[PDB]
Design a protein around this ligand. Structure first.
Ligand code: CLA
Ligand code: CLA
Ligand code: CLA
Ligand code: CLA
Ligand code: CLA
Ligand code: CLA
Ligand code: A1EB1
Ligand code: SQD
Ligand code: A86
Ligand code: DD6
Ligand code: DD6
Lengths: 171, 168, 87, 188
């Protein structure tokens, strides 16, 4: 009855209200937590991984921040994290991410379960709002790129650590 | 219907009428606890931050009173605790805050219609008409929110650097 | 006087048994219960992982954090009370 | 209440003699020599058969998991070892001792969270007031079993039997590490 598994039933609660629902839940994990929380987690993870892929492939090929100095972060994005933890910049990034996560995540997860809005809006449309067909097409494109770049960032990091990054931006 | 966060509506109906209302309460602490205590704490924090920023600037410039060994505002706390009058200032603050115990306890549970952070220390009638009162309340709470960040930055920059007046 | 706090004919106590925290939703209670339990267990573990000494190693922040373990009990009980009440 | 006769779990090998049989269950009443499931009639302190079924299902499931862990830890197959953590103690019952608090303290924590959050309606048991809960029905694998009655009951009877054997076995591997000889062929 499913579309990604056209031999074994169709998963419950995956009726098709969310975009990109092909019924791929072989483990039936849509019952532990509400589907709004799962969609919010998928979208947040995808946005984080797309920004992570862009940042990794831009830093690794060579680009430095305003006054980013010369340290082992500037050598590669491999050691950039361990460099910036010691310099304390990761604490500032954690503070900014924590502030936005308090406001955005607390509001966004508190109100779907109460009932109030689509799972993952944030209302920062930045342009395209009137063409609702393009809105749903962009939702589908967003979740597809989300899954693709979750896979892409996983592959990037595992490839680089499997050879300890001998300076390979194709990797 | 929220103003600061336009993807929400009114983080509990507690945020409906008071001054400086922008619908900004993502963690729903306005509806979890009574908002009069929150406004008292906010106004009290902002007033403390305002006078603390004014004092930290003036001691760092040269305004020093009689005696009071001339040291920077970073070490002024320890210098005056070892001197002694910090304890007397603490005693005076404690007396004022015992009166504040009485004021807040009367305000929260009936029998007194006091506004949060109100008092009645208004010698010059700058809040006689209600519209002037609303305007002065908005200016006061905006100054509170600004001066919290101002004094926090002043203290942090003074602590991490050696110390100057503009704090780099 | 006081409030009718007896709940012997009901399966859950009313929300008024929480006093000043009678309007806090259940999710905040549970999250703060877990956080207070974790912080308190860490603070009391900093007294047996490191031998507490006569004045040298007392660390009053760990003492004040040690009071979160009995506080974490009350928070997860209040989480259940608000959950049955629907809040 | 549910009077123990509709509960699946009777065994053919306790009706192995001439007279009595079936697929895998005994026909004339399941095995209860001490009548422990009839103890609810005198005093409400004694639990109902629903609580007893939930207790034995939990014990059986933990015992399957425990005996499988005993069979695998005892000779090889250990997780890869990194810094500040070695899964090298092949001897069971002492493996949690040689383990950092971030690892043994995390198993107990998540077990406790899963136990507390799946405890909705255990006290609606002890009194026969099933409605919800339905003994061991945590939801992990509901709608995965067959939708008829004979196959579902067969699957449940398989679960109960394997479970009971595992209980008796994990308690045979235990009580033998404690005192030498409670299981003749031990291997552990
Ligand atoms: C998953 C996302 C992610 C993460 C974890 C990092 C992490 C890192 N990047 Mg990086 N980067 C990213 C995405 C990311 N980047 C993207 C998308 C780009 C654009 C191509 C870049 C471009 C970039 C450059 C050019 C450089 C880094 C550098 C660094 C390192 C130090 C950064 C630092 O000091 O920040 C801590 C300091 C701060 C002030 C925090 C930043 C605060 C911003 C505004 C983020 C806050 C949240 C933000 C608003 C997003 C919320 C969106 C929401 C509104 C929806 C660190 C390893 C630098 C480095 O050392 O590498 C060698 C460096 O030179 N990155
Ligand atoms: C062997 C049986 C079998 C058959 C006949 C199909 C058939 C199909 N799968 Mg599929 N799939 C299978 C096994 C199978 N799959 C398995 C074992 C997995 C898990 C690894 C998947 C995971 C999967 C995903 C994630 C998706 C499909 C999709 C599809 C459809 C589009 C064709 C395509 O891209 O194939 C894909 C074939 C393998 C990935 C098609 C009806 C797509 C769909 O539903 O489009 C509407 C889609 O997005 N499949
Ligand atoms: C949040 C408010 C705040 C706080 C906590 C402080 C704290 C401090 N100030 Mg300060 N100050 C403030 C606001 C504040 N100031 C403001 C708004 C001004 C006006 C610009 C000043 C002007 C000022 C000067 C000029 C001096 C201080 C000094 C001091 C230090 C010693 C205070 C002392 O012993 O007083 C003791 C106070 C009492 C015993 C109160 C007496 C009781 C009544 C009111 C007497 C009435 C007559 C201490 C670090 C001194 C310093 O540098 O310390 C070394 C110093 O010379 N302050
Ligand atoms: C160990 C037993 C115990 C328990 C179950 C409680 C439980 C409670 N106390 Mg409490 N309290 C305790 C010991 C205890 N306290 C002790 C030893 C003292 C003396 C320091 C106090 C002093 C105290 C005060 C002064 C107040 C409470 C309040 C409260 C209630 C609000 C908690 C809340 O929502 O936080 C969020 C809550 C029912 C508050 C309340 O609602 O009063 C009814 C309140 O104002 N307690
Ligand atoms: C945690 C232990 C436990 C519990 C709670 C139950 C519970 C149950 N079993 Mg069960 N069973 C168990 C272990 C357990 N079983 C084991 C290990 C075996 C394999 C030998 C069996 C084999 C078995 C069969 C073949 C049948 C049941 C049946 C039943 C049900 C009715 C009988 C009754 O009231 O027993 C109540 C049981 C207890 C209260 C357990 C406590 C045991 C006593 C009081 C204390 C310990 C004494 C014991 C001898 C310990 C010494 C060491 C020991 C390890 C050997 C009930 C749901 C019947 C059924 O399915 O009905 C539908 C049935 O026909 N059981
Ligand atoms: C081989 C032993 C065995 C068998 C036959 C079963 C059988 C069953 N379990 Mg079960 N279970 C077992 C071991 C077993 N369990 C263990 C060890 C655990 C602990 C992790 C659980 C935890 C568990 C939960 C929490 C729940 C069930 C449920 C169920 C029922 C629904 C069908 C299902 O998901 O199982 C299908 C099982 C199989 C096809 C056999 C397993 C195949 C091999 C052994 C896997 C090896 C890897 C079914 C009667 C659910 C229930 O009772 O709902 C009515 C339910 O909520 N089980
Ligand atoms: C961030 C953590 C995440 C995991 C934790 C967590 O959040 O779970 C929370 C949870 C379950 C849950 C959840 C819901 C809330 C139901 C729903 C959540 O979803 C939402 C948001 O809705 C998901 C979930 C699963 O989380 C359950 C929490 C249970 C909890 C917190 C249980 C504490 C017992 C305390 C005791 C017994 C104290 C004994 C204390 C003792 C014995 C002492 O005081 C001894 C003492 O010497 C001490 C130590 C100090 C001295 O001074 C005083 C003395 C001498 C007396
Ligand atoms: C081996 C352990 C000792 C087993 C003793 C068997 C015995 O008592 O035989 C008497 C019974 C006769 O029962 C009868 O068996 C008949 C068929 S069946 O075995 O129940 O399938 C059934 O019709 C009848 O009801 C029943 O009385 O035999 C069996 O049921 C046991 C079958 C054992 C199969 C081999 C075991 C290995
Ligand atoms: C040594 C080591 O390894 O670590 C190092 C790492 C690293 C990163 C290098 C370091 C650093 C730097 C750090 C951490 C810097 C952090 C800086 C930080 C976080 C600074 C906050 C500013 C707040 C502002 C501007 C608020 C504006 C408020 C404004 C503009 C308002 O208008 C408020 C408003 O209210 C009004 C007034 C009216 C209201 O009606 C409306 C609103 C509410 C809008 C350190 C310290 O060196 C440590
Ligand atoms: C919403 C909004 C805006 C926005 C926005 C944003 C941020 C949009 C961002 C979209 C974004 C950033 C989408 C990234 C996708 C990344 C992908 C698909 C990665 C693919 C990577 C793949 C497929 C493979 C990678 C490989 O590594 C692998 C797997 C192995 C290596 O050997 C080989 C390589 C390296 C090739 C405006 C308009 C800007 C402003 C407005 O106000 C608000
Ligand atoms: C922590 C740890 C491990 C572990 C573990 C864990 C969690 C192990 C858990 C083991 C567990 C949970 C074991 C339960 C046994 C219960 C039994 C046997 C019940 C018997 C009950 C019986 C025999 C009752 C029989 C009767 O009642 C009947 C049926 C009817 C009545 O009329 C008559 C009587 C009374 C006779 C590893 C994995 C092992 C090694 C690892 O390294 C570290």
């Amino acid at each position: 009855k499913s579309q990604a598994l056209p031999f074994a039933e169709r998963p419950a609660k995956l009726d098709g209200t969310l975009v990109g629902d092909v019924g791929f839940d072989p483990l039936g994990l849509s019952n532990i937590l509400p589907i709004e929380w799962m969609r919010e987690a998928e979208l947040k993870h995808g946005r984080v991984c797309m920004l992570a892929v862009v940042g990794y492939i831009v830093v690794d090929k060579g680009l430095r921040a305003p006054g980013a100095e010369k340290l082992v972060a500037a050598t590669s994005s491999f050691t950039a994290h361990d460099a910036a933890v010691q310099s304390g910049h990761m604490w500032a990034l954690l503070l900014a991410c924590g502030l936005f996560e308090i406001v955005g995540a607390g509001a966004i997860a508190s109100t779907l379960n109460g009932g109030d809005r689509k799972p993952g809006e944030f209302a920062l449309t930045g342009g395209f709002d009137r063409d609702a067909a393009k809105l749903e097409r962009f939702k589908l494109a967003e979740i597809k790129h989300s899954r693709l770049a979750m896979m892409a960032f996983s592959g990037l990091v595992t490839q680089e650590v499997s050879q300890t990054l001998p300076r390979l931006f194709p990797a | 219907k929220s103003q600061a966060l336009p993807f929400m509506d009114a983080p509990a109906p507690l945020d409906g009428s008071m001054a400086g209302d922008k619908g900004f309460d993502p963690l729903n602490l306005s509806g979890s606890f009574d908002i009069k205590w929150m406004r008292e704490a906010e106004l009290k924090h902002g007033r403390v931050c305002m006078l603390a920023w004014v004092g930290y600037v003036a001691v760092d410039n040269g305004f020093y009173v009689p005696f009071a060994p001339h040291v920077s505002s970073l070490a002024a706390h320890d210098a005056a605790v070892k001197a002694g009058p910090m304890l007397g200032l603490l005693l005076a603050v404690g007396a004022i805050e015992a009166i504040s115990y009485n004021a807040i306890a009367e305000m929260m549970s009936g029998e007194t219609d006091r506004r949060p952070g109100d008092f009645y220390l208004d010698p010059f009638n700058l809040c006689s008409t209600p519209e002037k009162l609303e305007s002065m309340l908005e200016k006061e709470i905006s100054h509170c929110r600004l001066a919290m960040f101002a004094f926090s930055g002043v203290v942090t920059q003074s602590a991490l650097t050696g110390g100057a007046f503009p704090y780099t | 006087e006081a409030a009718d706090t007896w709940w012997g004919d009901k399966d859950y106590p009313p929300s008024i048994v929480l006093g000043i925290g009678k309007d806090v939703p259940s999710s905040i209670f549970g999250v703060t219960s877990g956080l207070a339990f974790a912080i308190g267990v860490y603070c009391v573990a900093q007294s047996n992982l490191v031998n507490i000494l006569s004045g040298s190693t007392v660390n009053g922040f760990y003492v004040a954090g040690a009071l979160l373990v009995p506080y974490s009990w009350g928070l997860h009980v209040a989480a259940w009370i608000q959950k049955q009440n629907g809040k | 209440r549910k009077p123990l006769s509709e509960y699946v779990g009777a065994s053919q090998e306790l009706a192995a003699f001439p007279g009595g049989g079936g697929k895998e269950g005994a026909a004339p009443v399941p095995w209860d020599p001490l009548q422990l499931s009839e103890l609810w009639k005198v005093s409400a302190n004694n639990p109902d058969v629903a609580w007893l079924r939930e207790a034995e299902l939990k014990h059986g499931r933990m015992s399957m998991l425990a005996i499988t862990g005993v069979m695998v830890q005892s000779a090889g197959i250990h997780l890869p070892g990194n810094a500040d953590i070695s899964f090298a103690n092949a001897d069971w019952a002492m493996a949690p001792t040689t383990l950092p608090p971030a690892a043994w303290g995390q198993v107990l924590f998540f077990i406790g969270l899963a136990e507390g959050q799946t405890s909705a309606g255990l006290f609606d048991l002890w009194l026969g007031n099933t409605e919800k809960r339905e003994p061991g029905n945590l939801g992990w694998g509901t709608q995965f079993l067959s939708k008829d009655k004979k196959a579902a009951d067969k699957m449940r009877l398989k679960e109960l039997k394997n479970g009971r054997l595992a209980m008796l076995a994990i308690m045979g591997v235990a009580f033998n590490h404690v005192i030498p000889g409670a299981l003749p062929g031990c291997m552990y």
